[PDB]
Amino acid sequence: TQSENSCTHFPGNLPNMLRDLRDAFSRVKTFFQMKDQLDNLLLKESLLEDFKGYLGCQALSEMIQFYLEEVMPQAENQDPDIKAHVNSLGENLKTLRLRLRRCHRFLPCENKSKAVEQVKNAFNKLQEKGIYKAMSEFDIFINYIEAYMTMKIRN
Amino acid sequence: TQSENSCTHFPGNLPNMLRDLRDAFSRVKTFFQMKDQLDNLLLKESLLEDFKGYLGCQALSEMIQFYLEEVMPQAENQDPDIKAHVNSLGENLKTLRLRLRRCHRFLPCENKSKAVEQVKNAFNKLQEKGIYKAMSEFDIFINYIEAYMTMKIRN
Numbered sequence: 001t002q003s004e005n006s007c008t009h010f011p012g013n014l015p016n017m018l019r020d021l022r023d024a025f026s027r028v029k030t031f032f033q034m035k036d037q038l039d040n041l042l043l044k045e046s047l048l049e050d051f052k053g054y055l056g057c058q059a060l061s062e063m064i065q066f067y068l069e070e071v072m073p074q075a076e077n078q079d080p081d082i083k084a085h086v087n088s089l090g091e092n093l094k095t096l097r098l099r100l101r102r103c104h105r106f107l108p109c110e111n112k113s114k115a116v117e118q119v120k121n122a123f124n125k126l127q128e129k130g131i132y133k134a135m136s137e138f139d140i141f142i143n144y145i146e147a148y149m150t151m152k153i154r155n
Numbered sequence: 156t157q158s159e160n161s162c163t164h165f166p167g168n169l170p171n172m173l174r175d176l177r178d179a180f181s182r183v184k185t186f187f188q189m190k191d192q193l194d195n196l197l198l199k200e201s202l203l204e205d206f207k208g209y210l211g212c213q214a215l216s217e218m219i220q221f222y223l224e225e226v227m228p229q230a231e232n233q234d235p236d237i238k239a240h241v242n243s244l245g246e247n248l249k250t251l252r253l254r255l256r257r258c259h260r261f262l263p264c265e266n267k268s269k270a271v272e273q274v275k276n277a278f279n280k281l282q283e284k285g286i287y288k289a290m291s292e293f294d295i296f297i298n299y300i301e302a303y304m305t306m307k308i309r310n
Binding site: 042109114 | 156166177180187188190192195198199206207209210211212214218225229230233255260261266270271278284287290291293295297299302303304306308
């Protein structure tokens with residue numbers, strides 16, 4: 001929403017959170033280095049370049065979702081004694097994700113427009129009448145799209 | 156991806172596209188103003204303010220999806236003679252959406268990281284071995300997340 005959070009100890013506790021995250025991976029680092037028997041690199045440096053440019057929020061968001069949904073669910077089931085530690089590592093990753101999304105627009109690609117939620121709330125209460133009113137104001141929707149476009153093509 | 160499109164007649168044809176879009180709504184404007192029997196405003200000005208700030212790409216993207224998925228499918232079925240015109244209006248809206256997404260980062264919230272697609276491609280070909288390699292390089296993933304964070308908290 002119109003961002004800027006209201007979070008205490010922020011952004012001062014960010015380094016502390018990354019240390020908690022590195023300490024949780026340390027509890028599973030040996031198991032996984034021994035299972036991995038290849039010397040090639042997967043997380044290439046082009047990934048770092050994308051994190052630092054204009055699509056960085058989106059590339060980081062997609063990589064957090066990739067690890068929580070396509071990597072962590074199978075790793076956790078690799079041995080009964082690494083399961084609690086792999087789910088704790090996932091929780092520190094989700095706790096970090098939540099702090100950047102909630103506080104002062106640090107993961108803006110994941111925030112949602114409060115004005116859109118309100119229009120959708122009002123539309124749903126008008127029921128059938130919402131369809132006719134959204135269509136009758138379509139020209140106001142074109143005026144809003146043009147304002148977004150002019151803002152980029154104008155000086 | 157690393158954006159900047161390569162589109163001819165751009166951005167010079169943008170005003171022409173919005174005129175084509177206003178001409179298509181004009182073919183259905185009377186039907187919908189007569190069905191709508193209310194005088195209140197649905198598309199409030201707070202929506203315009205969100206289109207112009209930091210969440211503007213996301214608010215515009217969510218409103219295009221709202222109209223194509225929750226408004227247009229029922230409006231099109233309101234009368235047999237307005238169906239072709241409501242689906243044409245939808246097509247001009249999708250044609251516009253595609254031009255801003257493809258050309259020079261005009262709808263960046265909808266572009267995808269090419270480096271993420273490549274890592275996901277390589278991970279899938281390693282199969283079981285991909286799980287172990289993604290977990291062994293988890294510390295490199297923390298280094299990339301820290302680079303995104305430092306870039307905002309550092310001067």
